[PDB]
């Protein structure tokens, strides 16, 4: 129980996410669009591999 | 009638959309471009499934 | 002639385009990239239909 | 020689590129990303023509 | 050893990366998104070449 509580606290303690302050929504856009494009890039590679 | 009016008010009351103030059009861009990229990603998956 | 002049003025009067001031080039980017994506999204659908 | 020098000066004089000041890297992003998207759109049309 | 240390220092000395200050995360987005799109464009060309 206390171990779980500490584990949860430890997990949160371990967890950390940081982005630009002024350019926050810019960073969020980098985080979103690149992730999508990167997924597509990787997908196209699979399309290319299959096609090959 | 009054029920409909209240329902409309309740619907509006329930409705809520929020984005970054300074980075508003950035957030709108995140909202627009990611949605379109995400659609392409999903549509590439359809192509991939159909290819497979 | 005067009718054409008024028509031109009327057309200009009817014409109106507005975007965010501070986030102008952001809005222009939304206007440009989404249009390109959205076109491709629609063009992927054409490929999907043709694939189907 | 002097003609070439003047021609170089004239070429530079003719040459002119302008983008938003505050939204410079935004404009550069519009310039880069849209160009690449536009290329993909055109290249999808080539795929579509070839699909048909 | 000292040569390696100097080489490391020289490598760092040679190494240099610069982007817009205010439009930093914008520049990082240009750096990320264009790189992905450019890769996709190049990968579409591969698809086009194969298809042809």
Swiss-Prot record, chains A, B, C, D, E:
PTM sites of type Phosphothreonine: 17
Signal peptide: none
Subcellular location, record wording: Endoplasmic reticulum membrane; Sarcoplasmic reticulum membrane; Mitochondrion membrane; Membrane
GO cellular component: calcium ion-transporting ATPase complex; endoplasmic reticulum; endoplasmic reticulum membrane; mitochondrial membrane; perinuclear region of cytoplasm; phospholamban complex; sarcoplasmic reticulum membrane
Membrane topology: Single-pass membrane protein
Residues found modified as N-acetylmethionine: 1
Sites bearing Phosphoserine, chain numbering: 16
Principal subcellular localization: endoplasmic reticulum
Keywords: Acetylation, Endoplasmic reticulum, Lipoprotein, Membrane, Mitochondrion, Palmitate, Phosphoprotein, Sarcoplasmic reticulum, Transmembrane, Transmembrane helix
Lipidation (S-palmitoyl cysteine): 36
Tissue expr: Heart.
Gene Ontology biological process: acrosome assembly; adenylate cyclase-activating adrenergic receptor signaling pathway involved in heart process; cardiac muscle tissue development; circadian sleep/wake cycle, sleep; intracellular calcium ion homeostasis; locomotor rhythm; muscle cell cellular homeostasis; negative regulation of ATPase-coupled calcium transmembrane transporter activity
Family statement drawn from the similarity comment of this UniProt entry: Belongs to the phospholamban family.
PANTHER family assigned: CARDIAC PHOSPHOLAMBAN (PTHR21194:SF1)
Protein function: Reversibly inhibits the activity of ATP2A2/SERCA2 in cardiac sarcoplasmic reticulum by decreasing the apparent affinity of the ATPase for Ca(2+). Binds preferentially to the ATP-bound E1 conformational form of ATP2A2 which predominates at low Ca(2+) concentrations during the diastolic phase of the cardiac cycle. Inhibits ATP2A2 Ca(2+) affinity by disrupting its allosteric activation by ATP. Modulates the contractility of the heart muscle in response to physiological stimuli via its effects on ATP2A2.
Assembly description: Homopentamer. Can also form heterooligomers with other sarcoplasmic/endoplasmic reticulum calcium ATPase (SERCA) regulators ARLN, ERLN, SLN and STRIT1/DWORF. Monomer. Interacts with HAX1. Interacts as a monomer with ATP2A2; the interaction decreases ATP2A2 Ca(2+) affinity. Interacts with VMP1; VMP1 competes with PLN and SLN to prevent them from forming an inhibitory complex with ATP2A2. Interacts with S100A1 in a Ca(2+)-dependent manner.
Protein name: Phospholamban
Species of origin: Oryctolagus cuniculus
